């Protein structure tokens, strides 16, 4: 001994049902009474199910009545005991997780039971053997096919979601409820980037995720009265201002890189600086910050000058709480908490795995780097069709609003994204 | 008391001393480890070590062999070897006694495997899914097998070879491919291998469509890379010849609208059951497929792809699932199997249990992600 | 202690001589009296040798007499003791092996003795050193040059065997005492493949060993009234019938592989099937059978329909008794036992090591994969001169009959071997 | 009591403290491990470790060195170092005392090696042939050596260099090769290296023939790949210009018959001793060769080839055999040595102890496996 | 405990000063009184320094007086104690090494002290932390910056040495005080190779170090009445005589290698032999000799016939005293002792590391193979400008005489070096 069990989880399942009758549906889906290790819990779950099958409300009173009529009340500890179960549940909404724990421990008991049974038969019947091996095969497989799996989503139901998506993509009108992006076509879908949202922009190297984020940050700060906080972990503050000066005044980048500057390309530079000086752009070019540092700096900024957006130049460079799989999840989770705290959209750039080439990016390409998928309420991919200087912005996830591809044009010479 | 037969063991070793030829049939059926007693284990090993040199096996050569490797005393000395040699009245039934020793050995292994699994149930708690998979595997690995005893007469193969050139299964929707298979037969495990962008997923979807909208058969698709949403998007895109770029980038022309309402009315009649849960186990496939057949019907099973579910176990476990549900299973792969098919695109087939081994050819429209006939 | 010894082997050597006087020749070649650890055995071996040198018969009586005259009878345990030695020999024919064991243990005692002697001299004489090291060199070498080696076979004697071979190759007439092969030139030498013989056909990949074996199996079954059992472990039953259909009716193989079939190439196919249906061909295409399975199936077949040949498509694919060097020897040995049991020729294909290319195959090329050389009473190699669609069949070993090269022509288009 | 000289040891260390220059001659003759006492071992090591830095060696620097590596106390403390420094009246005879220490060290090693071999005789029984080989090797490895003390005067080398351009050994049968060697000298180890199909075996056989049928010398050939039968087949095939294909495939024309009876009458007069036992040991070569000389005569020894008999030991052991039987030994190799010769075919020679280093050229007939002059 | 200390070294430092007053300068440079672990030694060192600062002679008497006046004599053990210190010094000239040992042990005590102090502060003040980490950084660095380093050599001082070198290179006249080389330009600088000198000639493979050494050995033996001992470890005695026959009589080397010999090229050979036979050239072509063997052979030769030069064909082939970094140093040191013993110049060829190519060879190229730099009183590099058949002989080190590049021409055909 002792047989795999979780009295605590069993207690929380039954408790949940007593706090919210709706908790019984998820529990009955995952468990049958016999999954409970403790006899009293079996009797109790069975009483609940019976009451439920009659279409009668399942609560402390009807379960008490049910058990009294089947002469099982005292045996399971009485009304007092039903009370304790009600106090043993940390949160009724977590009932599936408690249920799964109970189920897991039931499956293990069946594994142990059938394995032992096979071992015993080995010493006894001795005898047949060929039948023994076959039923040993048979019995072990039966343990797995027990857990609550499924279900398959039916094509009809997806077609509905698919069509309703196409509805939203055309029903697209037209107010910008969040922070305008400057890319009117991206604003149609998003509306635009909204407060408290975690926005993830993933793209393979050379695609232009950095330029994309800077263009957005640049449009917000120069066009709207809002402040943008940019964290550049791979690129210095001057190296990044160089790129948004070019983008601003239409100055050939390579031209600046080589000193060459036509007399009027210079006049072009002074107007860029003039207009860019009025913008509320705050840059932190610290090589590998932790999320706490990011958070603290943004915190001080919002209450010192006000804050509208946070842009982080790629997330895989943020160092964890210590000195990578689990580590990235916490950062992801932390960035979402950052968004909620400061009531601001957080744009975190992400790099994609080399899977896109093994096939147009999809969720599974960041799923091997997850679980950013869960935390992000909006995940965007950048894909160039020709690797036409046109680039695609695939919105793969959006919690409130449609899913589709917005299209923009990229100008290499100025490192810009323009409308279409 | 662990299953054993000291008497059977004693007859085997004894028979070898009585007639050295008896070692050949015993060596066929047994390995030293099958003997329950170490002494016998040591002895049978010595016996084999001499034959391999290859010197005659008898009391002297075996004694000398055990002594040389410092284990004559541990096995009971020359007394015991002589006891074994003097007890044996015949060596004609060596394989009878050998087979008894082998059986007891198997039963011990059965017991050892099961006990271990029982013990793991307490110690690893913690790893339920890994435990159930390796317990399946461990039990399977106890039993060999065997190959009953049926030679195939040439007459029988000839008919199957003739009929194997000049549609008894499930229609693929590709006439030229239905020629080589006619079509996708029950309990077959079909592997479709390919390189980046051809594309494997498009091919899988097309067959899943052409089966489900033309036959009253239900297909169960398991996509591990793209979501059910993306999968259905590609399907109606190919179903009604709709340009993907227009579905994605909102704006649809009225050719597309009418072309769409057509494609999803047509696709609503199928016949299609999707599961897009990232990392799935083969057994999770079985649970959902068994519950589907028993409630609805099926089937054909499409998996995209198999290196997202050590591949040998998965593959073998897939064959069992196919044979269990009496339904064809197509599993894609990136570059035991019933049919192997690699990928104007060419479908090369390398393996087919009953059908003709050759090459088919299909076209591919880039903008609809659709494969079509010539 | 205790000094390396084998009283059991010593007893069997002396015993052997008492059971068969001829046993003394092999024993005296390998041993001198002093190799015996036990004094009585030395005295006894010495008595035997003395009797033998007088040209007098060596048996229990003359050895007894000899020892009585040298006053050594009682000292060695008397006549009673000579009796015990006679009961201590499992088989007189195994005397060389017993002798070698005695010799081995004598050599070890000399190693121990001289090594100890060197160690002792190290502490004593101390003194000279340079002489010490030299005599230590000298003394250790002397231990090795003691074992019975040799002898060199003289060229005169081989020339005789060589000439007698050339005699057999021309004296070749003409009756086919075994199973006819269909290749008249191979039948001259073999006569043809005979009952109980283990025939090994080795060849590098692409040479055509599989096609060779199938042609033979095909000729036997279609021409003679005999049944052939074919085990194909690398190739399926249909894939193999495809190859013998082509061979039979003269159908271009690649032509079948591509569907293409000229109207009359089809009529060619129906005659092949018709004629091939009457043949007694039994195929087992089990991927990796054990020898016991092979044996059991052949066993049932011979007593159910009768059996004439067994062909196994390459031996290195047969799995051993467990779940490779020693393992292959047992399989080899088992296949020979299979041949003897069913009184049938067994043709086991073998693959050659990549040594042929490091130089026309020879015995050493399967010797690194042995000891198949010993078990096989006939070993054949296939060698193509041009890697003229002509292929050579080198018969390297044949227990009863000549050794030489038989020549056949290979037709790629039909996968056939034809006469010449 | 293990051979030792505490007094010699004490003088050596003492001499070093008395005059730091004494360390150089001692360091030439000794290593720390040669000192029987650990204390002295530790001390001599410390001494060397300071010189290597390279600081002056004296009581203070050495004390500080031992203390730093936590071993001042173990070696007896400053008391002992001072005892050693105060006892020594001179350092002029350091190497006398050093050589005594070295000798005792050698004797200990001799004892340790021999005891080990004696002990292995009981424990590994089991591995006789491996035991005898490694005992040979282990004893050889006790003794170095040395190089007596003979400078070669230029006058002496000049004569050998002059005479080394413008047939004192055993004739090869190839005049142009006999020029470069004149011919195969006694006690020489001759290595003939080559790549697949040239061929090494053909070359070896040809020389074995041309020596044995033209001289009254007996050759001992050891073939590990082809049998004595195949070896003789090739020889009479080359001897009488007979097409191999005809000997193999029975049918001989009467040119071949008369040509054959000629070749084996001619080959019967030799002179040839073959051993075709698969894996042979160098010592087994010696046993058979020693028994052959002492009974018949010889010789020349031909080995085909050496990587079928770690190669360093074999090679060295072959040189000893050559020097022991006062006979040339030709060992082939596939791609310490007296003559090295790599392979219309070109014979390149890379090494020759006394002869001229150059290149010879010979023809090769494919159909007879024979090498001939130009 | 116990605190790192060296009473023995402390005693030798103070002792040294009492034996040679000059020893105080090096000691005071490396140590202050507080470095001494023993209080008496501090008091004593302080007394010495005080006496010294007054410009008064530091000896047993004035230190005694000084300590008596500061009431510290008895406390430090009296005059008797100053006596003991004087007997505690193995050699006054080794005072720097003793001093360094004392200093080392002082630095360790400071490391231990400050580390402990940091640990303690960790438990106490707890409090501030940020200041703690900074002062912990600060305090640890302070331990290192304590040891006596420096000084930088000033450019003025080097310019003087540089100019004085240029003086010697032109002031070059003109007598050959040592063994003439035959290369008049190398003789100007060296004068030439002198008795007891260890001469190291290093060069990358293919440059011609072997040919260089042979030419020198050849010139000495044929021109002067002196004997040369050549050790060739990579090349046989005949293979080496071949090269000096060619060099001698002007015979094309490749011509000899191929038998080809023009009638008069042969007459050229007989004159070479005639002249070369009178030369005192002794060659030992033992593959890998130890230095003791080299030494013993040279020893016997000098007292048997007389000896003038020793040439060793590359040093990295000499095997050590056992059966490589430390090993080469001992050989180097041993070769220098060889030179001193036999009062003869020893020319040891050396191979250079593959650093020259990573840049004209310099000292650091043999420094990674040292410490041959120290032992050699003359280190020469051979460098070819074109890898003009001209080769450079860079004399990087010469104890008595200039440093520069002597230039010679190499003739491939004869394997010779000629003047210019």
Curated annotation (Swiss-Prot), chains A, C, E:
CDD domains: DnaB_C. GO terms for cellular component: cytosol; primosome complex. Residues 176-420 are annotated as: C-terminal domain (CTD). GO terms for biological process: DNA replication, synthesis of primer. SUPFAM superfamilies: N-terminal domain of DnaB helicase, P-loop containing nucleoside triphosphate hydrolases. ATP binds at residues 206, 208-211, 243, 351, 397-399. This is Replicative DNA helicase DnaB. Changing residue 209 to A: Loss of helicase activity, reduced ATPase activity, still forms homohexamers, ATPase not activated by DnaG primase, still interacts with DnaG, almost complete loss of ssDNA-binding. It catalyses: Couples ATP hydrolysis with the unwinding of duplex DNA at the replication fork by translocating in the 5'-3' direction. This creates two antiparallel DNA single strands (ssDNA). The leading ssDNA polymer is the template for DNA polymerase III holoenzyme which synthesizes a continuous strand; ATP + H2O = ADP + phosphate + H(+). It comes from the Bacteria.
């Amino acid at each position: 001994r002792i047989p795999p069990q979780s009295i605590e989880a069993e207690q929380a399942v039954l408790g949940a049902v007593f706090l919210d009758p709706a908790a019984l549906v998820p529990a009955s889906e995952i468990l049958i009474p016999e999954d409970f290790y403790r006899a009293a819990h079996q009797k109790i779950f069975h009483a609940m199910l019976r009451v439920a099958d009659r279409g009668e409300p399942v609560d402390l009173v009807t379960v008490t009545a049910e058990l009294a009529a089947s002469e099982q009340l005292e045996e399971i500890g009485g009304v007092s005991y039903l009370s304790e179960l009600a106090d043993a549940v940390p949160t009724a909404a977590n009932v599936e997780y408690y249920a799964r724990i109970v189920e897991e421990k039931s499956v293990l008991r069946r594994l142990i039971r059938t394995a032992t049974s096979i071992a015993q038969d080995g010493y006894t019947r001795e005898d047949e053997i060929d039948v023994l091996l076959d039923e040993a095969d048979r019995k072990i497989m039966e343990v797995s096919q027990r857990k609550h799996s499924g279900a398959f989503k039916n094509i009809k139901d997806i077609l509905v979601q698919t069509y309703d998506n196409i509805e939203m993509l055309h029903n697209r009108d037209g107010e910008i409820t969040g922070i305008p992006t400057g890319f009117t076509e991206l604003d149609r879908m998003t509306s635009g980037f909204q407060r408290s949202d975690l926005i993830i922009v993933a793209a393979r190297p050379s695609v232009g995720k950095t330029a994309f984020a800077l263009n957005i940050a640049q449009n917000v700060a120069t066009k709207t009265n809002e402040n943008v906080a940019i964290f550049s972990l791979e690129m210095s503050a001057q190296q990044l201002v160089m790129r948004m000066l070019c983008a601003e005044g239409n100055i050939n980048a390579q031209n600046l890189r080589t000193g060459k500057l036509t007399p009027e390309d210079w006049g072009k530079l002074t107007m860029a600086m003039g207009s860019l000086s009025n913008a509320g752009i705050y840059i932190d070019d610290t090589p590998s910050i932790r999320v706490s540092d990011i958070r603290a700096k943004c915190r001080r900024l919002k209450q010192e000058s006000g804050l509208g957006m946070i842009v982080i130049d790629y997330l895989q460079l943020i160092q964890g709480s210590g000195r990578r799989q689990q580590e990235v999840s916490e950062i992801s989770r932390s960035l979402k908490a950052l968004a909620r705290e400061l009531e601001v959209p957080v744009i975190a750039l992400s790099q994609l795995s080399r899977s896109v080439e093994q096939r147009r990016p999809m969720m599974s390409d960041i799923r091997e780097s997850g679980s950013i998928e869960q935390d992000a309420d909006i995940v965007a991919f950048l894909y160039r069709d020709d690797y036409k200087n046109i680039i695609e912005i695939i919105i793969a996830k959006q919690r409130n609003g449609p899913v589709g591809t917005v299209q923009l044009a990229f100008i290499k010479e100025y490192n810009k994204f323009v409308n279409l």
